[PDB]
Every structure is written in structure tokens, then in C-alpha cells.
Amino acid sequence: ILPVSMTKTSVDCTMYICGDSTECSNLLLQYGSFCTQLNRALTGIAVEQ
Amino acid sequence: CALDPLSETKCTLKSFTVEKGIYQTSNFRVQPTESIVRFPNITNLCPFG
Numbered sequence: 001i002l003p004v005s006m007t008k009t010s011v012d013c014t015m016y017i018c019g020d021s022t023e024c025s026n027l028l029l030q031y032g033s034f035c036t037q038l039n040r041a042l043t044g045i046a047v048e049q
Numbered sequence: 050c051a052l053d054p055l056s057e058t059k060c061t062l063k064s065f066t067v068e069k070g071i072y073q074t075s076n077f078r079v080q081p082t083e084s085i086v087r088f089p090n091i092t093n094l095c096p097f098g
């Protein structure tokens with residue numbers, strides 16, 4: 001028996017962190033590309049899956 | 050960026066040339082309508098009279 005795929009899961013980084021908000025999200029931009037470089041990671045996974 | 054979907058891509062990829070294949074761009078989050086406040090009926094009246 002072998003694993004082959006794992007469940008494809010993408011997670012919006014911008015909502016998870018700042019949910020349903022704005023004046024939260026403005027802070028989230030001061031951290032740079034984290035959110036945008038995460039979804040890249042979790043995509044690279046979910047693509048090769 | 051906002052003209053239309055195709056031109057959101059180019060703003061994600063930082064490219065005018067965009068090759069084939071599905072890209073994620075943004076996240077549409079249905080925005081609420083108004084509000085609901087719901088509390089029991091008054092339960093009591095402080096002996097004002």
C-alpha cells in the first residue's frame with residue numbers, strides 16, 4: 001500500500017490572517033510578500049499533487 | 050489591473066506576455082448585507098413608576 005497524493009489544500013493567506021477586515025489587512029501589507037509567497041508555496045504543492 | 054480578469058493576471062505575474070493555463074488571481078469574498086441584533090423581550094421593567 002502506498003500513498004500517492006495528499007489532499008490538495010489551498011489557504012488564502014490574506015483572509016486567514018486578517019479575516020473579514022480591512023484596517024487589519026493594511027498592516028498585512030507592511031510584511032511584504034509573505035501572503036503572496038505563501039500561496040505560491042501551497043500552489044506548488046497542490047500543482048504537483 | 051482592474052480593467053478586467055485578463056489584466057489582473059498581468060498584475061499578478063508582472064508580465065505582459067502570459068502563457069497558457071490557469072492562474073489564480075484574487076479572492077472574491079461575498080460581502081455581507083447589513084446586520085442583525087436579537088435580544089430577549091425586555092424580561093422586566095425596573096420599578097420606575
Ligand SMILES: *[C@@H]1O[C@H](CO)[C@@H](O)[C@H](O)[C@H]1NC(C)=O
Binds near residue numbers: 089090091
Ligand atoms: C417575545 O415576544 C413575542 C411576541 O409575540 C413572543 O411570541 C415570544 O414568545 C417572546 N419571547 C421571549 C423570549 O420574550
